[PDB]
Curated annotation (Swiss-Prot), chains A, B, C, D:
Biological-process GO terms, alphabetical: 4-amino-4-deoxy-alpha-L-arabinopyranosyl undecaprenyl phosphate biosynthetic process; lipid A biosynthetic process; lipopolysaccharide biosynthetic process; response to antibiotic
Organism: Salmonella typhimurium (strain LT2 / SGSC1412 / ATCC 700720)
PANTHER family xrefs: UNDECAPRENYL-PHOSPHATE 4-DEOXY-4-FORMAMIDO-L-ARABINOSE TRANSFERASE (PTHR48090:SF3), UNDECAPRENYL-PHOSPHATE 4-DEOXY-4-FORMAMIDO-L-ARABINOSE TRANSFERASE-RELATED (PTHR48090)
Annotated HAMAP family: ArnC_transfer
Name under which the protein is recorded: Undecaprenyl-phosphate 4-deoxy-4-formamido-L-arabinose transferase
MF GO annotations: phosphotransferase activity, for other substituted phosphate groups; undecaprenyl-phosphate 4-deoxy-4-formamido-L-arabinose transferase activity
Domain of life: Bacteria
All ranges on the Cytoplasmic side of the membrane: 1-229, 285-313
Cited SUPFAM superfamilies: Nucleotide-diphospho-sugar transferases (SSF53448)
Catalyses which reaction(s): UDP-4-deoxy-4-formamido-beta-L-arabinose + di-trans,octa-cis-undecaprenyl phosphate = 4-deoxy-4-formamido-alpha-L-arabinopyranosyl di-trans,octa-cis-undecaprenyl phosphate + UDP
């Protein structure tokens, strides 16, 4: 929970079939870290590549005066799991995640280090003038609002990989064993102070079905409200059907029969009341189902910064 | 599990942006504790405040001859989590929870200590002549009955913060890791002897949507009966539709056709039978869902007071 | 896993407001145990009684040359929990459970010990000529068949308290932490050899709503089949509606219109197909829900009796 | 994670009432293992047999110069549990599972050992010209495709028992405590390199209801997609009903009334919209239910092969 100036930096980079980009990535990333004036290390994690990426990483770590640690996985498990493997081997005070495709320039690293020295626990980035499609642009805005309400911190670009975390944030994320989650969201759940800064990127150009799968992951990770709306929806339908049934009953007695299908309409009104009550029942199940999920994840409830005892005198 | 007289008292107070009230709270609370004639300590827990509350607490704990312990959290986590942080640092025999807004006078503390010395494990309070709205007043009565049936102990005011717990009660509540719960309810699940006494309070004046959210938390924490009512409701609907279908079939044969829409009515009757069977199915799922929730919470099953072995002679 | 002759016997008796019966229970139970010719102990567990039962138990355990161990609970938790408390304090090779109301004579204890010496891991009892009501008598038969199919062992009377368990059976039941269960059922899940014998009892005369609650507990503890029947039921309804819809479509073209409400009937047939598909969906959820429950309970998968390694020569 | 040549082989064989086949199985299996030129052991696990199988196994293990280890279970628990018992007692580098009914010849063992020496972590088998029924043949093809998509490895015959696993694969499967699963599927989730080879078998001739039960186990073990299809199905129904309702409303105003039952048709269209929304609600529950199941199983997220640190110079 230290707010002291940073002394060492750790860089975490997942690798999966990056044979062509590695020589340039290592050179540019190394130069930027040397300009910090601090101790540093670089972690390369191979996620079961098949294009000689592992051979290059071993050679780099054996090079004279190297600061590169190579972690090799037995097979492909995912980018999220590869990052968590790196978190378990870091030794620095500030942790920075980066992409191996060189979409995010390594030259932006010094800016994040300087911003963190001002006391921010988490430092994010926002890509400027990326000119995405309207559907994707609109979706990003919706996600940003949802994260702001739930976590209290904003996220302009949830999909950007360039971010900085302080060590106390990383240690607690290692205490969360939930399989479905999003690391940037998890950090803001424990962060006290956060900010974002603008960055530039390489020109563009996941798939559509990957995007829709991601929407469910975000919503389930953030809120259980959708299960609450089932009961609200049902109560509206149930009340509407009940009111119409009474109106038809009272209307015909005070005004005599009016339509040939008058009996059929009353039967439908009773049916709609039952349909609404079914939504309430499903929402009733949702209240228990949602609470089971929180207990299963078992996130930490609090973290203590310091305790002050009265003087023994 | 001691019924012996109290020797030390611990006071737990959550703090969140109470800069204006702290100077008066510390003075009044300190005086009342000094009148007990017992050893005492006061715990102040800051839940990520932003109005210089943390600075005052540190100064108070460093004051000469102080009995104040200050616990600082890295960010805001909630009143419930802040209280649990205090429970993990207490050292007394009787634990008292209090509010930092001075709604509940600190001068009532000696009364609770005296009542606990008579052998009661839990001592509650009831606010007199608070003149709440009819909807809120009616809701409190319903909650009191529900808690009485389930726990065997009554609770006139579930929302009052001034309460006393003996150490054996606090230790077991620390063994319950359920995220959604209510501390006063949890205490009565392990208490042998309990009572409530009247108190006075400052004049009044959560929001409406906060109240409805709280109702679900209370019901889910107390009972799984609502999932049982789905099957009962369905059986009534299913039996009604089946009876009407038979009546129409028998009626027309013994009395000939009667209505133009006679065929349509029979189809509706068959439908209502299916609708009821759907409620049974959802209730069937509820039986398993509710039992999963109890196992996940994993509350203690029993506590042993003492064991008497026969004499070795 | 020993099949050796029994050397010591442990008797477990839950107590809850048995002030009048205790003096006779202790005398009769003590005499029967002395006739065995083996070492023995008696455990009395008080489940938060309020009629001086605890005072008598302490006096009995302090009596000269006593074999009685008294376990006192801080409050009432249930008969099932009281029994589990006794299991955690036994020291014998054969464990016998008995009722404190003297409905089951203590004089039947020697018979169970003799039967267990023949090599049976579990020994049960069946009450003769109890002349229960037809509804209760029929329910017992249904439960017996269900337990036979699932466990491979029969149970004539699931409600009889007089039973004997060998130590290896008790130790494993202590490794099952499921809150909702039935001890006699759990024993047969690990027993290799079991039998039942007839006994006599005091003349009769739970409530009706207690009986229906118990039926759900038994079924959920034994099988998940009821969730499978939802899909089977839906497929029948869906196939029926689809067939009728085709018949109406083909029938009218090859035979012209026949009824005024012909269009309405086709709409109902389409509806019934949707209704059936809803049952399939609920059953689809049940497949996952039922498997979650088994993992949460986390019963032992196997127990090893002995391992024979080849001779070192 | 060694790719080194195999030095010792372990054979695991579950036994349940194989009195007639054991003498031939032991002789043939022993000869094949002696031809390998490596150290070897054979494990026989008795799953609560009742036909003198246990007596023969003990005699075999006590025979002079024997390599047979006998593991006896207290009762029948299942073939899957019996295999896991063997995995906990193996001591070799390559693990081979075999059937005691001699359907799979033991003479195929040397082929699997040779194939594993080429660097494959898992080696499977495919039965040739078994001439199964069309329904069973078609089902096998569907399962093979499903496993290929999910695991990245194919499985021609999921039901064949003859397979080889390297030690690193077995150790991790012991870290998966899920009760419902399929061992061959679990191995491919951690394997880097896998292959299958053809084998021959004895001529044929589970039951039908056993086959349908197995289909649910496979699908639940592999994917949660079926819960996603509920929402997709509902959206189609909801959109269709909404479109038809608008068409009827617009059509009649611009073309006047057309049918006597025009009002009834509109009511049905509104109903179908509600029916579809119910499918969405169930799918909404499925998103949470499916994620609870993955956390409960708690499979390992990754395995590290080696870590290369930079030279200290």
């Amino acid at each position: 929970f230290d707010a002291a100036p940073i002394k060492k930096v750790s860089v975490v980079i997942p690798v999966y079939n990056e044979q062509e980009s590695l020589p340039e990535l290592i050179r540019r990333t190394t130069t930027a870290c040397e300009s910090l004036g601090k101790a540093w290390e670089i972690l390369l994690i191979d996620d079961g590549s098949s294009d000689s990426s592992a051979e290059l990483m071993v050679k780099a770590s054996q090079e004279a005066d190297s600061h590169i640690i190579s972690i090799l996985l037995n097979r492909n498990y995912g980018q999220h799991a590869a990052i968590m493997a790196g978190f378990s081997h870091v030794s620095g005070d500030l942790i920075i995640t980066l992409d191996a495709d060189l979409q995010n320039p390594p030259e932006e690293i010094p800016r994040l280090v300087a911003k963190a020295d001002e006391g921010f626990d988490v430092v994010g980035t926002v890509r400027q003038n990326r000119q995405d499609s309207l559907f994707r642009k609109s979706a990003s805005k919706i996600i940003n609002l949802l994260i702001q309400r739930t976590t209290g911190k904003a996220m302009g670009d949830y999909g950007c990989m360039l971010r900085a975390y302080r060590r106390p944030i990383i240690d607690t994320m290692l205490r969360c064993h939930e399989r479905s989650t999003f690391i940037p969201i998890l950090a803001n759940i424990f962060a006290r102070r956060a900010t974002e800064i603008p960055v530039h990127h390489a020109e563009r150009e996941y798939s559509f079905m990957r995007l829709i799968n991601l929407m469910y992951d975000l919503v389930t990770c953030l809120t259980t409200t959708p299960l609450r709306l089932l009961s609200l929806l049902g109560s509206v339908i149930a009340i509407g059907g009940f009111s119409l049934s009474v109106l038809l009953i009272v209307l015909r007695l005070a005004l005599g029969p009016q339509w040939a299908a008058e009996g059929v309409f009353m039967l439908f009104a009773v049916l709609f009341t039952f349909i609404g009550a079914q939504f309430i029942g499903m929402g009733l199940l949702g209240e228990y189902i949602g609470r089971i999920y929180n207990d299963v994840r078992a996130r930490p409830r609090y973290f203590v910064q310091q305790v002050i005892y009265p003087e023994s005198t």
